Amino acid sequence: VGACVLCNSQTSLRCGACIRRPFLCCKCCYDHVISTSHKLVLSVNPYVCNAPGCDVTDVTQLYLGGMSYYCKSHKPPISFPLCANGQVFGLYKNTCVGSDNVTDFNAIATCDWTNAGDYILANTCTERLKLFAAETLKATEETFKLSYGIATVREVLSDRELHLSWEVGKPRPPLNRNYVFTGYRVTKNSKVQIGEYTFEKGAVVYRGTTTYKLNVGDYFVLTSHTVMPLSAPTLVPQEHYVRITGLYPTLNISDEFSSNVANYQKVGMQKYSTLQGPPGTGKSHFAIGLALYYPSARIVYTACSHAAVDALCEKALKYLPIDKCSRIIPAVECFDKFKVNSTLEQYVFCTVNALPETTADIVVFDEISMATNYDLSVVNARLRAKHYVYIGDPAQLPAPRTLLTKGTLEPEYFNSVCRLMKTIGPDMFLGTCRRCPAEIVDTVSALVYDNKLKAHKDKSAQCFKMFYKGVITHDVSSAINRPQIGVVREFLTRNPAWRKAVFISPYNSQNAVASKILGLPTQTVDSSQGSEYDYVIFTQTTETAHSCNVNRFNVAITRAKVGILCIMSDRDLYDKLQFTSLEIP
Amino acid sequence: AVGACVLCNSQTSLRCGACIRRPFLCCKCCYDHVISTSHKLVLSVNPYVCNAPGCDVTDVTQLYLGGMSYYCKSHKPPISFPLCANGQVFGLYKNTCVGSDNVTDFNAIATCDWTNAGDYILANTCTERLKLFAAETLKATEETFKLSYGIATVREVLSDRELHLSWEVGKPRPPLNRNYVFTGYRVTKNSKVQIGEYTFEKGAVVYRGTTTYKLNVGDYFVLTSHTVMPLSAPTLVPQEHYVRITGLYPTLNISDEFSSNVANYQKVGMQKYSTLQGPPGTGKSHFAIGLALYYPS
Amino acid sequence: FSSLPSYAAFATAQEAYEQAVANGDSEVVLKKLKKSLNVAKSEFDRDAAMQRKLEKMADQAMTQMYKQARSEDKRAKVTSAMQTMLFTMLRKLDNDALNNIINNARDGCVPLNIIPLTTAAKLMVVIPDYNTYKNTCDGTTFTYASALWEIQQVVDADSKIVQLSEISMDNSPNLAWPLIVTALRAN
Amino acid sequence: FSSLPSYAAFATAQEAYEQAVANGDSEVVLKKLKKSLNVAKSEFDRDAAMQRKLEKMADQAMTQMYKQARSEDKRAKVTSAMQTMLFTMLRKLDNDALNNIINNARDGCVPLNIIPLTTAAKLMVVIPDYNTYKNTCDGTTFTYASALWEIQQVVDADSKIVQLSEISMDNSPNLAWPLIVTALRA
Amino acid sequence: KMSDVKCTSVVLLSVLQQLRVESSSKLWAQCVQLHNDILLAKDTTEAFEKMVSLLSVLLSMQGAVDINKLCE
Amino acid sequence: VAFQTVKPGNFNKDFYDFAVSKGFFKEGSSVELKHFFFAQDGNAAISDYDYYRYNLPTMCDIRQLLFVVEVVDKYFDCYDGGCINANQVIVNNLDKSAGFPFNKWGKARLYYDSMSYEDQDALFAYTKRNVIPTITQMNLKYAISAKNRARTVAGVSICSTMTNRQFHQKLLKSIAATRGATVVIGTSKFYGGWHNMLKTVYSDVENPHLMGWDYPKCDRAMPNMLRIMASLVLARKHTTCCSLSHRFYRLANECAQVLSEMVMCGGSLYVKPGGTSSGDATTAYANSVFNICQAVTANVNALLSTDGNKIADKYVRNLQHRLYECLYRNRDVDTDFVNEFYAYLRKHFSMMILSDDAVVCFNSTYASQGLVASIKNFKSVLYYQNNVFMSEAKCWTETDLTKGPHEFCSQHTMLVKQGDDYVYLPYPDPSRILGAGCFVDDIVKTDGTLMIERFVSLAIDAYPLTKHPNQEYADVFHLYLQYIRKLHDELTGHMLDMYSVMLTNDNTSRYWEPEFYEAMYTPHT
RNA sequence: GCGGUAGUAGCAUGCUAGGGAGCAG
RNA sequence: UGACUGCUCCCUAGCAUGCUACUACCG
Ligand SMILES: [Zn+2]
Ligand SMILES: [Zn+2]
Ligand SMILES: [Zn+2]
Ligand SMILES: [Zn+2]
Ligand SMILES: [Zn+2]
């Protein structure tokens, strides 16, 4: 019994056929029911014919017996149709305001999430629509993952390998670690305790995070949770203060981050600022500068992971005293230098996973592009702070959309705040290119970055250009090409100093074929930023919309301090990139 | 108490009473079965018969709904309601009824007394729940067959491998050999214990008892029967041939004693079922033991 | 009620009545075509208002036999439950120690109160205070009912284990005090 | 029941009967409008009978489901209703011995066991800093729950005994501060 | 005024009970004893001391955040 | 082992605040709170079962018990009993527990549904040739009371109740449907039931005093011989339906099931030594038979233990002489003297008996001379025939009949003026009513608007307090009336601010004026 | 001008059944 | 985990019966 979405009037009905079942208002509920197959509605009891053993379950299909609801095939002579009057029968039948055009709401509800139009809906919607949308995505995707087999390790041969089958009738989960399993073992009766695993090109290659050795009958599935509803908005209705009052102006400063202090000064004069954070532009350095500028701040460092907030904790105690940092790791092995399980902490780093709900000082959010509207409202649902900052950039990396089928969504509508730096403009920027030199940086500036990032350093001609083609042939959930893999060593051979690099590749099983040829380590394309060498070899091995789109392996090209490799078999952006070209042997 | 009818698969509660096996029948579908036979008694949670104290009427359409009861016209209260009407016999789930336009297939199986080869042309060239009903009707009526015959009393004992044996009254006699193996049991003063597995042949009565035993006076035999209960799965699943023999274990080494065997197994893992042409002594008993080594898993 | 023999008769009676009334011919027109309609309340007199009373009785009877079908399914379920309880509790019966005491009875009847006494393989003593623990379950083994039992697990009111070293005198006030000492018949 | 069609027919019939009895008209022609009028409450007072039934049937179903909703959201907030009620009645009691321990608890000094009542038994209280030690502990006496307790043990958080006059101000950033005072009732 | 004490002792034992205190047999025994001795008292100055002793059982846990609930 | 506790009651703070708004609970007032929900710790179940240690093997004076049983049976001639078929039994509330182990699979409804009338009748006729020992659970009660002693009832298995009902229900329901008798089970106290009961018990006794006693631990100290006698008296109506072996085997089933049964307390089976199981099929009537037995034997002891030479009424002397002969000299019943002693008792010692609660109107000048039972006689009788000491602090006596029983079924009696004549009204204990208002299981208690039907009944029971001379007592009833008014006109307010529609009409103003409650104590209905 | 039956609505009493609650031993 | 009874109030349903009015047919 709460307030309906489209009305905010206190109601008692919840659309039954609807996935997440939000509270709906009598007139507003009727509007939702008139345009869909969402034709079942639950009140304190479900609106279904309770004549013993019936079948009817549509709402208008029923009439109010006295203590019951019946179909016409059951209704007593004294009946009263539930759905009538343009207003469905429920509590608070008087306080109903509706919305004239709710096909916005019905469209979200009737949205099965297949096309990019679905996420144009998810963002270009209105608010409680926005939380309903993100939560519907999550719900239907954790229902997605379990339409698949039970990964039974049913023989064990060697280590790093398994003999593995699955359940019946179900297609199969993909190849790598965005879909990390977490199996659990049985005894005679019930289910207890294996761990975090994923299965890749073998023969089944499993990359278990923790130490364990598996036995017979050992099974795995992507164990799921219960996504419960959200509360706070994705972002508060923010505004810029008149003076930075209540915030502590410090006397002394470090000009290691002279690109930082003019950036913080109005941030205390304002609620939120999402920053233009190009890769390695001192963005992880950025939030640590304010840490010293305002050491009096309970400043909220959050990211998509303690693999991402990992980077926020990289220079944590290296810059701040020790006992003033803390991270809540729930009962996952990542950084553990801190004191753990202390929320009342001057500096609390964490992930959207499990920082408990409090009130703090200034929010600093890494990973804004890949995280969406769901966890966007999480930190503010977590926490009502002084002021807000999001570190990162939609110029990095979206999320993997398990159900988006037709035509990947813009970089620009990643989330409700991502449009803002493309409709309001960048609140901050950092062009301090500590990492890549004049090699790549402006060629990424003429890409999407406003001609905006300057040269760092000379151009030592170490990031490379290769004009190739290759031949690809498909398999389950990868794509394998050795005409370019053959080019890889062919590239890597004429100087053995080549091969001090990390292999970059989209279809990371193409490294499961390459690792046996070179011994070279693997680079995940999307989970890459934050990690890099000056030397990285990259076989894009595909030119499709999966592959050479604008801002995906964009994160892979900028991995080099000075010397990356790009066998651009694509004509997608090769027409731009300004690097050293040679003949192809 | 309540399941899905054969000819309809809708959820019904009506079982043809005069019918031998009594399968669940659907209201319209049950009426179709009742209109063409003498299967004119139908049981619901209670039997549809006139419960006026001490009546005789038992046909279905012969009855009307008298409140808490079912009556004949000779008993019906002024306020009645004929049970069998509307082209739909009165039972639970009277709405979900689909029927089959030509159920004389079903009636034919039910009215089949199993005398001619036409009976088993029915039993096979039928449809499916028809098929299980058919086989089960055969078995039922044949275990009712065997006991239309006398009680094989060994009433004198002369020598071994011989008996003095008579039977009960009015009944013809079971045949001569061991497809009809008896399993008699002995009495004391009151009830019926153990004897064993026996059959009686040309003597003077030659008995070929499987186990060791020596019989006494009054010793009787009949072909003791069981209770054939219904049957679920189909005779054979809707089968299909896989795309690779996945999930099955390809072995490296093989025995060419059965070189007539390995090419035979290879697609069998690429397929659900294979019934084999097995002529007598063609390594057929050898055949299944070859895969035993080929796929020891 | 539209599909009955009386509805067509009403339609024809009223078609004729209003036709001849718009004609407005005679007083016999209104008289007969208003006395025939008045057999129009004899028309769908009950061909629509006593049967409707059956659409009551049939509904009620169907509901009652619905209920009775359930009542007969619950019965079979509870029967299965009772009998599986019996057949799962007998398999604990320990059938050599109790076949031996029964065969010594003169007629086969033994008091019930001695069956767990003479043939149970597990004892559970409940002890309120330490002083009682001293006169009974002292040491790692004790004797009771003319048999010798060896202690195993000892738990307190919160069902957590207690090592036999803690049941001292002065340590007793820190124990949830109705200890449950379970023991096994020794041989 | 004013806004239904039968009311209009009834108004017409009653106007007709008024014209009749006011004109002193006929015997059978004014017998027209009650064999065609008292029928106008034969199908006005019935259509306006069943809908007047549904009127309160709906309301007695709505109030039933309202009471169900209230009772199902009342037994799902007990954990908090109970605590807020308890603390309202507590601050309403206005007792010094209770307010003392509640204020202490709201800042820091929670006990570690049931406060004993005899002039004997031991009480163990957690003192979290020094400022707090000032207000309660003055030398050898401990004032807590409106009573006096001679201190016998004060021990730091790393379990190391710390005798008394060691404790003062700038010599307090010396000890793991969740101290644990033992004391005995006066 | 004693009636206020008895009613608030009822409420106190209820909130202790739903804090799962009855999973510690001796603690629940002492709380039950104090609660039943408050309901039977006849002079308000011993009910008050058993009430502070009973409330200390709640103040000694870490389940009820106290400062937030003294919002005054 | 399982350790079962008892929770505290929920506080209804709104009713309490309202009560102190109307000026209640002020220091030094007479009406104060004494009934609460007392909580109990783990070892409260068994520490209560252990009270069966008060049941000792008692041998009875057989030649006196064999006469008292005739007199007590004479007290039960007005009724009729016998066996009934399975389709004649009546079971109010089929959804109650079915004992052990049946409570694993469903309530009593499941077992009354799954067995056809023929199965039930076969089961019943089985227990006339066999003994079915059963188990009994022991359950703690969760109810308001004035003392912190735990309470406990005996949940008897369905297999025992199902058959005891068919054995006893005809007589049990012929007892509860008779007016003007000695056993007053079934007689309501409303519509002038109380006045009729008291005017019946004050039949014509010449120097009437009223007397009431108390059985300490009545259910756990009752000797087994008296339980057996009670059941044998209840089974004296089966002289045509049952044969002799059938009657013995039913008695044996009764003993094996509700006398010396196996009690399942905690999670363990113990033996019950004796005394009544308080939750069996015939408790409230076996207790009445036992009550009458003890009163009769108190009279026998009081008349036999009197110096015969000092009695002046030469009819009572001959009655004493004949009584001794009939006890210790005769061997078969003497129906004429049984009738004569029963007549003497009904003349000089009239009783009103509920299941171990009793009122007696007795001839004062006879009890003064030891010709009927006084209270010392009851003390002696319970001492030697019941193994309890009855202190005279629980037994009351009253010498003015115009203020009736000092107590009976926990009600006091007031002689008030109704209409034109004076009637007897039963008023309760104000603390009880206030306590039922303040303390309750949550939602039943804390929010009234969900259940005003509660306060209406509580005000029904609290009405006669309006006629009390004390004034706080009347204020209890008026407080309840004003609280009902507040509840109602705030329910409509809530469902108006939750709405725009509310009560077009109600007629519930009757619930906050006394004419609705007054009517429940005037005789028409 | 009356009777009767049939209908319908209103109203009452009673009985059964179902549910919610209160008190008593 | 909730016993056996007894009484009482409130709500709903059903049926019959009973009472009254409106309309209809026939005598
Ligand atoms: Zn919906
Ligand atoms: Zn329906
Ligand atoms: Zn058939
Ligand atoms: Zn018949
Ligand atoms: Zn009998």
mmCIF file of N, CA, C and O (backbone and C1' of nucleotides) in Angstrom, chain F residues 96-97 165 186 191 278-280 285 511, chain H residues 1-10:
data_model
loop_
_atom_site.group_PDB
_atom_site.id
_atom_site.type_symbol
_atom_site.label_atom_id
_atom_site.label_comp_id
_atom_site.label_asym_id
_atom_site.label_seq_id
_atom_site.Cartn_x
_atom_site.Cartn_y
_atom_site.Cartn_z
ATOM 1 N N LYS F 96 -9.201 -26.805 15.079
ATOM 2 C CA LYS F 96 -8.394 -26.811 16.282
ATOM 3 C C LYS F 96 -7.459 -28.009 16.248
ATOM 4 O O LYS F 96 -7.722 -28.999 15.568
ATOM 5 N N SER F 97 -6.361 -27.907 16.990
ATOM 6 C CA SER F 97 -5.290 -28.888 16.891
ATOM 7 C C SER F 97 -5.798 -30.292 17.187
ATOM 8 O O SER F 97 -6.778 -30.485 17.908
ATOM 9 N N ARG F 165 -16.596 -38.232 22.040
ATOM 10 C CA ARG F 165 -17.757 -37.448 21.655
ATOM 11 C C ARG F 165 -18.945 -38.350 21.385
ATOM 12 O O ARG F 165 -20.034 -38.121 21.905
ATOM 13 N N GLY F 186 -24.233 -24.309 30.719
ATOM 14 C CA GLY F 186 -25.140 -24.000 29.650
ATOM 15 C C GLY F 186 -26.077 -22.847 29.929
ATOM 16 O O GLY F 186 -26.515 -22.181 28.991
ATOM 17 N N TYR F 191 -29.822 -11.659 29.973
ATOM 18 C CA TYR F 191 -31.273 -11.698 29.877
ATOM 19 C C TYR F 191 -31.890 -12.306 31.124
ATOM 20 O O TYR F 191 -32.834 -13.086 31.056
ATOM 21 N N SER F 278 -6.884 -31.594 31.441
ATOM 22 C CA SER F 278 -7.810 -30.478 31.370
ATOM 23 C C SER F 278 -8.375 -30.242 29.980
ATOM 24 O O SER F 278 -9.227 -29.369 29.828
ATOM 25 N N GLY F 279 -7.946 -30.983 28.973
ATOM 26 C CA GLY F 279 -8.440 -30.715 27.641
ATOM 27 C C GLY F 279 -9.122 -31.886 26.978
ATOM 28 O O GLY F 279 -9.122 -31.990 25.751
ATOM 29 N N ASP F 280 -9.719 -32.766 27.764
ATOM 30 C CA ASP F 280 -10.348 -33.956 27.221
ATOM 31 C C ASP F 280 -11.799 -33.637 26.879
ATOM 32 O O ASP F 280 -12.248 -32.496 26.995
ATOM 33 N N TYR F 285 -17.675 -31.523 32.932
ATOM 34 C CA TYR F 285 -18.744 -32.285 33.553
ATOM 35 C C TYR F 285 -18.231 -33.303 34.548
ATOM 36 O O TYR F 285 -18.849 -33.509 35.593
ATOM 37 N N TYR F 511 -24.028 1.866 19.536
ATOM 38 C CA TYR F 511 -22.906 1.298 20.256
ATOM 39 C C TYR F 511 -22.279 2.261 21.238
ATOM 40 O O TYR F 511 -21.423 1.840 22.013
ATOM 41 P P U H 1 4.745 -25.065 15.002
ATOM 42 O "O5'" U H 1 3.356 -25.599 15.569
ATOM 43 C "C5'" U H 1 3.210 -26.961 16.025
ATOM 44 C "C4'" U H 1 3.073 -27.010 17.528
ATOM 45 C "C3'" U H 1 1.724 -26.591 18.086
ATOM 46 O "O3'" U H 1 0.860 -27.694 18.245
ATOM 47 C "C1'" U H 1 3.402 -25.338 19.130
ATOM 48 P P G H 2 -0.652 -27.473 18.172
ATOM 49 O "O5'" G H 2 -1.001 -26.872 19.586
ATOM 50 C "C5'" G H 2 -1.223 -25.487 19.773
ATOM 51 C "C4'" G H 2 -2.312 -25.341 20.773
ATOM 52 C "C3'" G H 2 -3.659 -25.546 20.143
ATOM 53 O "O3'" G H 2 -4.724 -25.565 21.031
ATOM 54 C "C1'" G H 2 -3.093 -23.253 20.227
ATOM 55 P P A H 3 -6.116 -25.657 20.438
ATOM 56 O "O5'" A H 3 -6.730 -26.752 21.388
ATOM 57 C "C5'" A H 3 -6.503 -28.118 21.149
ATOM 58 C "C4'" A H 3 -7.058 -28.888 22.293
ATOM 59 C "C3'" A H 3 -8.530 -28.681 22.529
ATOM 60 O "O3'" A H 3 -9.256 -29.479 21.633
ATOM 61 C "C1'" A H 3 -7.404 -28.467 24.553
ATOM 62 P P C H 4 -10.628 -29.038 21.177
ATOM 63 O "O5'" C H 4 -11.514 -29.463 22.412
ATOM 64 C "C5'" C H 4 -11.519 -30.797 22.864
ATOM 65 C "C4'" C H 4 -12.215 -30.890 24.188
ATOM 66 C "C3'" C H 4 -13.621 -30.340 24.212
ATOM 67 O "O3'" C H 4 -14.566 -31.274 23.740
ATOM 68 C "C1'" C H 4 -12.414 -29.479 26.037
ATOM 69 P P U H 5 -15.903 -30.759 23.039
ATOM 70 O "O5'" U H 5 -16.174 -29.382 23.769
ATOM 71 C "C5'" U H 5 -17.483 -28.874 23.899
ATOM 72 C "C4'" U H 5 -17.780 -28.481 25.319
ATOM 73 C "C3'" U H 5 -18.800 -27.386 25.480
ATOM 74 O "O3'" U H 5 -20.119 -27.843 25.297
ATOM 75 C "C1'" U H 5 -16.984 -26.967 26.903
ATOM 76 P P G H 6 -21.080 -27.069 24.283
ATOM 77 O "O5'" G H 6 -21.534 -25.810 25.122
ATOM 78 C "C5'" G H 6 -22.120 -25.998 26.391
ATOM 79 C "C4'" G H 6 -22.114 -24.731 27.193
ATOM 80 C "C3'" G H 6 -22.592 -23.492 26.483
ATOM 81 O "O3'" G H 6 -23.995 -23.436 26.361
ATOM 82 C "C1'" G H 6 -20.660 -22.996 27.715
ATOM 83 P P C H 7 -24.664 -22.825 25.045
ATOM 84 O "O5'" C H 7 -24.595 -21.264 25.284
ATOM 85 C "C5'" C H 7 -25.287 -20.693 26.374
ATOM 86 C "C4'" C H 7 -24.665 -19.397 26.812
ATOM 87 C "C3'" C H 7 -24.767 -18.244 25.843
ATOM 88 O "O3'" C H 7 -26.041 -17.635 25.843
ATOM 89 C "C1'" C H 7 -22.590 -18.349 26.698
ATOM 90 P P U H 8 -26.691 -17.148 24.468
ATOM 91 O "O5'" U H 8 -25.893 -15.824 24.127
ATOM 92 C "C5'" U H 8 -25.999 -14.700 24.974
ATOM 93 C "C4'" U H 8 -24.925 -13.685 24.699
ATOM 94 C "C3'" U H 8 -24.887 -13.102 23.309
ATOM 95 O "O3'" U H 8 -25.888 -12.138 23.081
ATOM 96 C "C1'" U H 8 -22.709 -13.621 23.994
ATOM 97 P P C H 9 -26.577 -12.038 21.643
ATOM 98 O "O5'" C H 9 -25.715 -10.937 20.904
ATOM 99 C "C5'" C H 9 -25.487 -9.684 21.518
ATOM 100 C "C4'" C H 9 -24.237 -9.033 21.001
ATOM 101 C "C3'" C H 9 -24.150 -8.858 19.505
ATOM 102 O "O3'" C H 9 -24.909 -7.771 19.025
ATOM 103 C "C1'" C H 9 -22.118 -9.709 20.301
ATOM 104 P P C H 10 -25.670 -7.900 17.627
ATOM 105 O "O5'" C H 10 -24.515 -7.696 16.565
ATOM 106 C "C5'" C H 10 -23.692 -6.550 16.630
ATOM 107 C "C4'" C H 10 -22.523 -6.657 15.696
ATOM 108 C "C3'" C H 10 -22.850 -7.073 14.280
ATOM 109 O "O3'" C H 10 -23.332 -6.005 13.495
ATOM 110 C "C1'" C H 10 -21.029 -8.327 15.053
#
